[PDB]
Amino acid sequence: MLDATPKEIVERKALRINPAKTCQPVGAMYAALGIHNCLPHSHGSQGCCSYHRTVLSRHFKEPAMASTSSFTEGASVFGGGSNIKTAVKNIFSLYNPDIIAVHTTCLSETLGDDLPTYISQMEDAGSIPEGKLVIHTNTPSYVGSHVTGFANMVQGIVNYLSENTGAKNGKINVIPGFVGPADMREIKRLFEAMDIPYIMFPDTSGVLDGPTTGEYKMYPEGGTKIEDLKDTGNSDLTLSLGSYASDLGAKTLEKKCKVPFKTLRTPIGVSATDEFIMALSEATGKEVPASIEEERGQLIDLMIDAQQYLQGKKVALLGDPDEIIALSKFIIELGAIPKYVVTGTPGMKFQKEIDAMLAEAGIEGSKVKVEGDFFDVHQWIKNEGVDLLISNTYGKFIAREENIPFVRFGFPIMDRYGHYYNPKVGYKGAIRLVEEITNVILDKIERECTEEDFEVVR
Amino acid sequence: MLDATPKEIVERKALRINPAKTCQPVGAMYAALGIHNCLPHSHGSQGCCSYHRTVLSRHFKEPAMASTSSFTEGASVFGGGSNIKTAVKNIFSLYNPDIIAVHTTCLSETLGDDLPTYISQMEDAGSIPEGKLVIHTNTPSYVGSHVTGFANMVQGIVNYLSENTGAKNGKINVIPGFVGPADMREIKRLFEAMDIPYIMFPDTSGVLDGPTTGEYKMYPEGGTKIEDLKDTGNSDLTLSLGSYASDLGAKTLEKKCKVPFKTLRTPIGVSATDEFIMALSEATGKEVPASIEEERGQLIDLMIDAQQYLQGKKVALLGDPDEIIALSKFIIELGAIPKYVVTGTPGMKFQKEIDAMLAEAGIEGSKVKVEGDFFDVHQWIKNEGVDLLISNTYGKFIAREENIPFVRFGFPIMDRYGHYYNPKVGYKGAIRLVEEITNVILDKIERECTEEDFEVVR
Amino acid sequence: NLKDEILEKYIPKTKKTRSGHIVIKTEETPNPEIVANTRTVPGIITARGCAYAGCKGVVMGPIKDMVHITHGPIGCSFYTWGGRRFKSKPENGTGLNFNEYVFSTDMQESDIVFGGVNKLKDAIHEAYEMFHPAAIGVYATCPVGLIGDDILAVAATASKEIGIPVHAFSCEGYKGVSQSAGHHIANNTVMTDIIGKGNKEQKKYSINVLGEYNIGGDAWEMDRVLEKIGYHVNATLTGDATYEKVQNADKADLNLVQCHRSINYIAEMMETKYGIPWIKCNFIGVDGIVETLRDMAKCFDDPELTKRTEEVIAEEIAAIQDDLDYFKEKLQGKTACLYVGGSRSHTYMNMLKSFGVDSLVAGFEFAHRDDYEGREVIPTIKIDADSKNIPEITVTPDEQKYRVVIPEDKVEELKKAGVPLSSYGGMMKEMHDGTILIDDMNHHDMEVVLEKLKPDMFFAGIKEKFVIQKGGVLSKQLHSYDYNGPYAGFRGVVNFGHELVNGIYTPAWKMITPPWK
Amino acid sequence: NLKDEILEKYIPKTKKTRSGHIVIKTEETPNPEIVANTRTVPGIITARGCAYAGCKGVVMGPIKDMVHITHGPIGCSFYTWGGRRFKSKPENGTGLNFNEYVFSTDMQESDIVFGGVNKLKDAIHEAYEMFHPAAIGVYATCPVGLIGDDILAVAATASKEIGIPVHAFSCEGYKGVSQSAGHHIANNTVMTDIIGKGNKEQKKYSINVLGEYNIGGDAWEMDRVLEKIGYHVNATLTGDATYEKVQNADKADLNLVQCHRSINYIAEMMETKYGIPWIKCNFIGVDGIVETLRDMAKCFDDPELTKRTEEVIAEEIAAIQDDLDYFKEKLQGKTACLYVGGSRSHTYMNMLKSFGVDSLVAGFEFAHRDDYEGREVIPTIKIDADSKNIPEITVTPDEQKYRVVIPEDKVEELKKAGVPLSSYGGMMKEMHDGTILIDDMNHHDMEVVLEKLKPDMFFAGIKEKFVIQKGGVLSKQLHSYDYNGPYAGFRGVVNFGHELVNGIYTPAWKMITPPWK
Ligand code: ICS
Numbered sequence A, B: 001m002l003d004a005t006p007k008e009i010v011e012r013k014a015l016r017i018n019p020a021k022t023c024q025p026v027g028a029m030y031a032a033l034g035i036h037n038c039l040p041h042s043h044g045s046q047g048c049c050s051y052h053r054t055v056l057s058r059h060f061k062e063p064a065m066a067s068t069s070s071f072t073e074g075a076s077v078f079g080g081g082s083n084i085k086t087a088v089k090n091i092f093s094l095y096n097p098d099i100i101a102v103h104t105t106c107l108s109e110t111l112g113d114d115l116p117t118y119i120s121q122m123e124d125a126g127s128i129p130e131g132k133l134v135i136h137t138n139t140p141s142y143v144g145s146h147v148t149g150f151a152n153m154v155q156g157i158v159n160y161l162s163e164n165t166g167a168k169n170g171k172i173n174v175i176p177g178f179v180g181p182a183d184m185r186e187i188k189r190l191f192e193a194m195d196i197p198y199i200m201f202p203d204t205s206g207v208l209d210g211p212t213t214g215e216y217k218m219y220p221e222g223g224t225k226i227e228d229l230k231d232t233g234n235s236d237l238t239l240s241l242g243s244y245a246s247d248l249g250a251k252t253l254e255k256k257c258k259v260p261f262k263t264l265r266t267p268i269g270v271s272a273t274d275e276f277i278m279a280l281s282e283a284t285g286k287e288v289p290a291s292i293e294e295e296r297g298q299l300i301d302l303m304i305d306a307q308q309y310l311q312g313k314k315v316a317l318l319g320d321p322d323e324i325i326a327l328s329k330f331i332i333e334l335g336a337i338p339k340y341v342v343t344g345t346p347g348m349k350f351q352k353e354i355d356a357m358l359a360e361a362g363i364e365g366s367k368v369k370v371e372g373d374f375f376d377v378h379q380w381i382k383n384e385g386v387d388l389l390i391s392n393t394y395g396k397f398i399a400r401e402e403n404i405p406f407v408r409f410g411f412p413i414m415d416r417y418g419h420y421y422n423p424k425v426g427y428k429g430a431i432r433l434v435e436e437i438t439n440v441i442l443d444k445i446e447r448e449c450t451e452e453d454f455e456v457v458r
Numbered sequence C, D: 001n002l003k004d005e006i007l008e009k010y011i012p013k014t015k016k017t018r019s020g021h022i023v024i025k026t027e028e029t030p031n032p033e034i035v036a037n038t039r040t041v042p043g044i045i046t047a048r049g050c051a052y053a054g055c056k057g058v059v060m061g062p063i064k065d066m067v068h069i070t071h072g073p074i075g076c077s078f079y080t081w082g083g084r085r086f087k088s089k090p091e092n093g094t095g096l097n098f099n100e101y102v103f104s105t106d107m108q109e110s111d112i113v114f115g116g117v118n119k120l121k122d123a124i125h126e127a128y129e130m131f132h133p134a135a136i137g138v139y140a141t142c143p144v145g146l147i148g149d150d151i152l153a154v155a156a157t158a159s160k161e162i163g164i165p166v167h168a169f170s171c172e173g174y175k176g177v178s179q180s181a182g183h184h185i186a187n188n189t190v191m192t193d194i195i196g197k198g199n200k201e202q203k204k205y206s207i208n209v210l211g212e213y214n215i216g217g218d219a220w221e222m223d224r225v226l227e228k229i230g231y232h233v234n235a236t237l238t239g240d241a242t243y244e245k246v247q248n249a250d251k252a253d254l255n256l257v258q259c260h261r262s263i264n265y266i267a268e269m270m271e272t273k274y275g276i277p278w279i280k281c282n283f284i285g286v287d288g289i290v291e292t293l294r295d296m297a298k299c300f301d302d303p304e305l306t307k308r309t310e311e312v313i314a315e316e317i318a319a320i321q322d323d324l325d326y327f328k329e330k331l332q333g334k335t336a337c338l339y340v341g342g343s344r345s346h347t348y349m350n351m352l353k354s355f356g357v358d359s360l361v362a363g364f365e366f367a368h369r370d371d372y373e374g375r376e377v378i379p380t381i382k383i384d385a386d387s388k389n390i391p392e393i394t395v396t397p398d399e400q401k402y403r404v405v406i407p408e409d410k411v412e413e414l415k416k417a418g419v420p421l422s423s424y425g426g427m428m429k430e431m432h433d434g435t436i437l438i439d440d441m442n443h444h445d446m447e448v449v450l451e452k453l454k455p456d457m458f459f460a461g462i463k464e465k466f467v468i469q470k471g472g473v474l475s476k477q478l479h480s481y482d483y484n485g486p487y488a489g490f491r492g493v494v495n496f497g498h499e500l501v502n503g504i505y506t507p508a509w510k511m512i513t514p515p516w517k
């Protein structure tokens, strides 16, 4: 498998192979699905919308609705303004969302389409019904990644909606970053356990992890409500979880509405979850309840009980930056070694944060790469093997070819069922991770050992 | 592996091989650890106590405290009266439990030791300090199984503690059966989501799934409090979950205190969890909240989304009767086939209930055996294969030898970490089971398929 | 009626354009005119894709020993990484196979602003030096023409330097109105620059299967039956294809055309250029398969081949008859709707009806009028502005290679006999009376159909599957086959039937309503 | 001091009895008398097991081609199903191996009331007919003697009918005071009914390893080294043993005694009956291994063997010296306590000290005064009421087979040169001054030790491990080796060290306190 990948490495400066990222717009689509009664809209040629909808369905085994401007070759000449105006008329008439959240594609960005102008023209022409909203962000696919697209859509939501009206709400805003609906639910459960009122946005819980009730609902029950999105300008503080996904929105909200913010790691593992709980306690004066303390103590109990199978284990990780930073720290906290650590998403922060934690733990000889891909990681593994691979679904080819215990993590996971109900964040999520890691490690040991070395107890 | 097990089956009437049960006392020990500040006490030779404590620690990766009468050849001639009186004096002075819960062994049962006499003699002599309690049950290992022992200890608790004092508490008693602490937690969570006051007993949550805090506490935070055990006599109703483990206790409490009871299946899968929720609703008038209905809908959604991997799959199941009855029904609900279904625990009910659900689904050709063992199931598998094996740790040998996707379930699981944090009951536990079952089926498919049949999406 | 109920909610301008896309075929009007292959209405929630999907993702990508480089930002590459299930194996156990990789130039802002031709050149050389493939393909995406990149010239320069073929495809996503434009763009370059460049000797009883992409092993299943009868399968365009097998596509006596939409250009051009005739191939469902094998035998007109064809048919059907009987027992009386791309909405129909399943509505994303009605209408088809800039290629007889395969007496004789040589009817002309057809079906249309007809099952793709199933209706996928297959061939019928019965009889469908409601 | 702090909370009756079980080694009394091998105090929370564990679970179970039938209710069998990690492989790749099974008569109420002998008879025949083992063992459990079952007679009747040996063991759980009684019961039958029944020819340089059970592969690691030097390992009692190897244990020139407690009976009886001398061996820790190998070479007194011994010791030590340095760097200065059954507390000591770790407190569950103080004290020991009824067997020299292996004058010279021939010294001798021994240590005792001494680590078993670790102190298992191994031999030192360093430097130990406290 992957027979064409050589052990001997030659420098690739141009040919990208098996990428560890995708483009902006799906990130913006995912963020928009975290608004209640929102129809995401793709302003470009319709191939984009189809593909972006499709990956969301493959990951969540759920519907993922979105509309498109359906550019033709004529837009390449007269721009996409007439297309989007026509789309809005059809959207509100056929599908009646409360809000259309527009993002762009490499096509409309290359063309220099002017969405603020088109949007004000529709407002003037009366195509946006009373009570309805149209918002936008710009999501050039040749910049950044899907994580950047999420970040941009969050900034769009604050640019159009957040307002400081003077009426304080007593709440803390939380922008959870480019995490799944189960993660969103676990973050909300922690706020609720601390007794801390909040507004989370975006929030895809109850949108992309919902029930089958026998009736299809185009706009599912979940999503942050428009009125709460407006009310984010009246909050005391914004917690931005994961700098890549969430800081741009948090900073924009600070400039627009004077709401201060605090940036925190995605809460994966012990120290990152600890920092999130502490920030909640410090910002509100609220004590940490016994239930949360008990969960942390169960994690610690588990980390110690299972320690022998984790100490010194070499791990290859690939994924999105906020999640791989936090997960790499957790790997270190488990006693294991982040050996190869890669993101497809550009940016200095990943390099600095990973290098720093590795040096703090005394770990030498790891390879860390920004804008690396799955072909890089495979070549590195061929030169020096690892004990564990953690990545999205595309890691499975490496896992089989090299016989490496494999944990699916991040986006997209398209080949297992129910993962979107399992948190990876918090003490609870950390427990699930340690169970998965130890399970795949022990499964391999027990499949491959000689019969005389087979064991009842482990 | 298991090379001595032949395909050709010869009737075995006397030689038991690789049993699908263990003896009563550990079940009573487990029940006793579900009482706060209780020290379980093994009235017999000390080999029993050491073995029983050991299996609990191997399953839970936790401490499991118990004392013993430490019979010698002297007790075999004169009985164990002097041993248990000496034990009780040392226990209260050194270890200061609030209650000693005594069970017996095959040795003290064969000898006919008279525990009620020794206990009254101890009271008379002042060996039991005021405010402290000593209770007992009889647990002959040559009768039934560990499930029976649990059932007997629950009866002992009722016999000694439960009192109708005329002050109605407005509570429902729930006896959760021979299930793990995560299951107890999930059952409590559901009572609490429905807003129904309750008393659960026994309850090993916070006893065998506890945190590491850096201080060892001989008596963990959890366990049903003695004052609440007394108060079970003032309740409105008892729900007996799983007839084998729980009915004896529920019926005893009906005779002693006039608390009526209702028997329910262990709440595993759709119909059994539904029956439990409906019993709670019908008993109290309380509506089922949206949170529970959503969880149910997510389970249904998962069952439908994953259906192709489940339909028609042949499953071999071995375990304890209450759990295997409910799980076999869930397997049918998933569209799969309980092909070989075995318990080591004697009794007619299992045979009737499994036969009845198979008939109802139109399934012919399954083998169902009461007092069967793992050697039986292995021989059946050599004659006609299965697609899935579900059992405790000891199924791992059959799983490897016959290359069968394997799900660890029930007691004891001694070779993985953190399973005691994972419910198998309720809609949440059902989702976990589906994930595990589909994961192991897909893991095999993807390990064994030809390279050209390897897939990104599943 | 259904057409009026579907049209009701559309605003007037949309109502007027959409009405022609919905037709009810009947007793009196057997081949009603449909409007097809026009632009998608903005904001209507279409399932259509782009020209790049059609060229790179569909036609070209299955060529397993050619490195396919996407010239674009990363998404266009990422979204073609294994989602379409064309299966490949290393030829002779040893040849190159790139199915598990995707390749691109990963365009950045500096490429958009200053052009991407230098990065493309470097990527082509890197791919050549690392992989030494049989050929390299370069595929345009949305920005490529706009930023001024001349990929044709970059490819030609690179090919001259590295010494293997480099093929450029101008399949920018906005071209045309759907995946269909991409098929056309691919066919042009395959015909002109690949087909006919080989020098293998032609074997006896040589056929090609055109428009067949080996989704979930379909082509291997067809080949198993064809080889057993005695045919030599010269080339399959392009499922499990080597570049060299495509180069030798002219070394055959008969072209079988499975997907008419995607491959008809090459079928017509190979007939003009080489004289190789073609027939419509319908390898899905017993009736389709049998009729295809019988038509092929008539074309070769060989007594022993004809006899073997009947022996093979009888044994394949006998081996599955008990399964076929079971599917009919379990499914008869149920109703279906189908929604495919440009062909499968039609090719699966003989098969549901065999099981006793009645198909009420058939939708298509992007088929043309010639797919719905027939190829007689091509001269009556108005070229529209959005697809007029797709180049039309003209070929002439190759003086050296042209041959009369089936002389004119025999062609007439065969046509009389019911063998449609080098011609094709349509989904409509073979559908029962009453069938409703919807071109470019959208979410709104689908949901009206579901609420009004209440079908037991609605076949579609991944974007619709879960929408349909949230409503308690089974939706099996007709593109990905729900990660199974083959669905083609005799064994295909069995796999399809077994998965369908399993779907319908999943117990959870009856457990949706909780007992407290 | 620590002894008084341990004793304080005990009630007067218990304090007076426990006091003698705790002693401190000092300069003025290097070898203090201890009270050992007495009944467990009821209710005190002991780690001790029963005589059935010592007989079936420990000594006999590892014989891999004998079917071991527990005659009892099911738990006695269930609890001996793979918890003790004696490793076995099929002899020469083909022989029988029952390691993965447990066998029982699964006694029911009817067996208790009416006797179990008919079910036992039937189980023996079923085992024989299904498995055709080398031999069958029948093991008593708590009820057996009391319900009147004469297993000795059932065994003998069965053996004559089936034609293979059947050995009965009256190891009812309440016999003796601990696992130790069970060792004795096993050794009696092994000596009288198995050893010496074979007829294989003796090889040159033949040794047995006695009281070694191949936990986690320990025996295979010692065999690797011994075979490289040139010894023939005739038998290991009983790790990875076949029944026939035990039958031929008399075909050796020297018995190595690893576990004195469990196997001393057979060592002494083999010396009496056959003339085979024994030496204490310790294959745990570099120092023990090296002294054992040097002692063995002095016994055989052969220039080639003596030279190979040094060559192999140098080569094995050089290969692991980098690791040994590492362990000492990472661990020196730390303190430990050790609590094992009857032997490992002693054998692992040379090892922790080599790493710079100071052992403060040691104990045995069930060792006798000989194990603590040396066998020199055996004249002073008198058996109490609770162990009196374990049969004491006498052997006489076998007139045909007895030989003088090492002449008496050579025996005298070896003893003067420090070789421990047919002699044993005790854990106390090589423990340093100031350190404490606790016999039958209980939970109360262990907790005082932990609170007062704050050791960095406390080695014990499964029942204590999580108790110790919940208090933030590392507890590695010295019975099961935490599912690793070997811990014996040269490779064993590296495995042990690696796991120990890994345990100490696990990051979570420092994360126990949450940041809000
Ligand atoms: S090429 Fe076409 S949409 Fe004819 S673009 Fe599409 S692998 Fe469909 S109905 Mo996916 S005209 Fe093939 C098709 Fe049919 S990708 Fe496949 S299933 S038979």
Ligand code: ICS
Binding pocket: D054, D058, D084, D179, D211, D213, D215, D259, D260, D261, D262, D340, D341, D342, D343, D344, D345, D478, D479, D480
């Ligand atoms: S036999 Fe004994 S308790 Fe000497 S009963 Fe016990 S496999 Fe221990 S300290 Mo478990 S006298 Fe062996 C023993 Fe030592 S089971 Fe093992 S580790 S060296």
Ligand code: CLF
Binding pocket: A023, A024, A025, A045, A046, A047, A048, A049, A051, A104, A105, A106, A107, A141, C050, C051, C052, C053, C072, C073, C074, C075, C076, C077, C079, C140, C141, C142, C171, C172, C173, C174
């Ligand atoms: S219609 Fe155009 S050719 Fe077709 S698939 Fe779309 S871009 Fe590509 Fe898009 S997915 Fe992202 S936003 Fe551009 S990089 Fe590509």
Ligand code: CLF
Binding pocket: B023, B024, B025, B045, B046, B047, B048, B049, B051, B104, B105, B106, B107, B141, D050, D051, D052, D053, D072, D073, D074, D075, D076, D077, D079, D140, D141, D142, D171, D172, D173, D174
């Ligand atoms: S001290 Fe030893 S282990 Fe105990 S019984 Fe006695 S021989 Fe056996 Fe057996 S079945 Fe269960 S585990 Fe006991 S209560 Fe009886």
Ligand SMILES: [Fe+2]
Binding pocket: A060, A061, A062, B301, B302, B305, C466
């Ligand atoms: Fe779903």
Ligand SMILES: [Fe+2]
Binding pocket: A301, A302, A305, B060, B061, B062, D466
């Ligand atoms: Fe634990």
